[PDB]
């Protein structure tokens, strides 16, 4: 139909044209994309840093050191740069915040309904932080789902981007003081327009055949 | 077709209409989306099981026989049900398949480039299994990214879907021989059309305000 073309044509830009900026509306749309992404129990265990100024992107680019210098240009030449972050721990106060927000949005017809939603999220949140002891990983997964949504989304807006795992999270967390605020940086995504130097823009996309990765029953 | 419109209008279907099946074109499109999703170093550490037959969907819904009974109707009433599986461990045979497929796809100009690509992927793959000891979680994250991409894609195709974490992965894994093949189920996503008995379709969307989850610099 339409998004299939977007999916088959989008790519990880290797070089950005620093002079091509997102339009005022697009800048707002990418923020909307970030927030409306789904998440288990609507937990939204994330926080985003959107860098659009030269100074802002420079602070983000501090994480592209060591063996990650190959990603410095991308972080500095893109119009906007999104740092996706996950909570370091699922706290009850935040869980309450999530339910109160759903209540204010008119999702609960009765107080019994709200209580039943708190319970549902509670069991899930408990299963991960008290029994499986993988709450940090559970929350990180939701941030990655968000990234997936975000990448196809910006591509559908006619925007170029690249997901980056090659950066120093310790350096980034310290630069923005995320540790104390209760967050950790996971993926950095510069968004804008590719430049003529983006050799990946003209290369064919490559994926494993479906006979290997897919099973139909 | 505005992508922001689909993001704001999409929702998690709580009940599907068994008579409304995907068209052959949509069934093909769904597989294209799963296959073309991006991933760290094009690792594609996943496997998908697509159940379109009533007997196939029945087997999947067996994982919701415990305290997840409420989720059983979703896996059976939906046209197609996709379970996203992550590799349990990153073997050198898989790293070989990916770089060979890329070579076959013409992404490498010379034999040295192919080598450098394989070196960069191994660098990242080694750091996760040898140093951080989190390859299982790193691969699970890629699978979640695929889910994010997927949910948006089907929504944009005009299809209803719902991501499900409420299922027993141990039962599902044993039902489809997983674990032996080197995979583990993570998310189940039934795709199709919602029925008039879907309350979430009329209900408003709820997300935390940007003043809490987003910071601009
Ligand atoms: C990874 C994941 C797991 C989910 N598991 C379930 C589930 O077991 N049952 C269900 O009804 N909804 C499930 N959901 C749906 C969420 O509650 C939903 O995404 C969230 O409330 C936001 O609503 P929306 O998807 O309509 O935007 C899941 C969502 C995600 C992302
Ligand atoms: C989570 C994640 C991390 C990535 N990290 C980097 C990175 O640090 N630098 C880079 O240039 N590409 C990076 N990529 C790009 C991938 O190699 C790319 O998604 C993959 O080769 C498939 O190509 P495509 O995105 O053009 O379809 C990353 C991709 C993902 C999904
Ligand atoms: N897996 C969860 O426990 C969960 C539970 C519920 N319900 C609430 C009562 Cl426990 C049960 C019927 Cl599904 C819903 N829900 O509302 O549809 C969604 C999720 N969810 O994950 O997002
Ligand atoms: N050959 C590729 O297209 C490729 C190139 C690069 N770089 C060049 C662009 Cl500036 C780094 C070398 Cl400095 C990166 N990357 O940023 O790491 C990843 C991939 N990749 O697919 O793996």
From Swiss-Prot, chains A, B:
The signal sequence is none
The record lists FMN as bound by 10-14, 71, 165-166, 205-207
User: Reaction catalysed?
Assistant: 5,6,7,8-tetrahydropteridine + NAD(+) = 6,7-dihydropteridine + NADH + H(+); 5,6,7,8-tetrahydropteridine + NADP(+) = 6,7-dihydropteridine + NADPH + H(+)
GO molecular-function annotation terms? 6,7-dihydropteridine reductase activity; FMN binding; identical protein binding; NAD(P)H dehydrogenase (quinone) activity; oxidoreductase activity; protein homodimerization activity
Q: What is this protein called?
A: Oxygen-insensitive NAD(P)H nitroreductase
Which terms are listed as keywords in the entry? Flavoprotein, FMN, NAD, NADP, Oxidoreductase
EC annotation from Swiss-Prot or TrEMBL = 1.-.-.-, 1.5.1.34
- Single GO BP term: 2,4,6-trinitrotoluene catabolic process
Query: Which residues does the annotation say bind NAD(+)?
Result: 14, 41, 71, 74, 107
According to its UniProt entry, this protein's organism is: Escherichia coli (strain K12)
**What is the activity regulation comment for this entry?**
Subject to competitive inhibition by dicoumarol, nicotinic acid and acetate with respect to NADH. Subject to uncompetitive inhibition by dicoumarol, nicotinic acid and acetate with respect to nitrofurazone and nitrofurantoin.
Q: Briefly state the protein's biological role.
A: Reduction of a variety of nitroaromatic compounds using NADH (and to lesser extent NADPH) as source of reducing equivalents; two electrons are transferred. Capable of reducing nitrofurazone, quinones and the anti-tumor agent CB1954 (5-(aziridin-1-yl)-2,4-dinitrobenzamide). The reduction of CB1954 results in the generation of cytotoxic species.
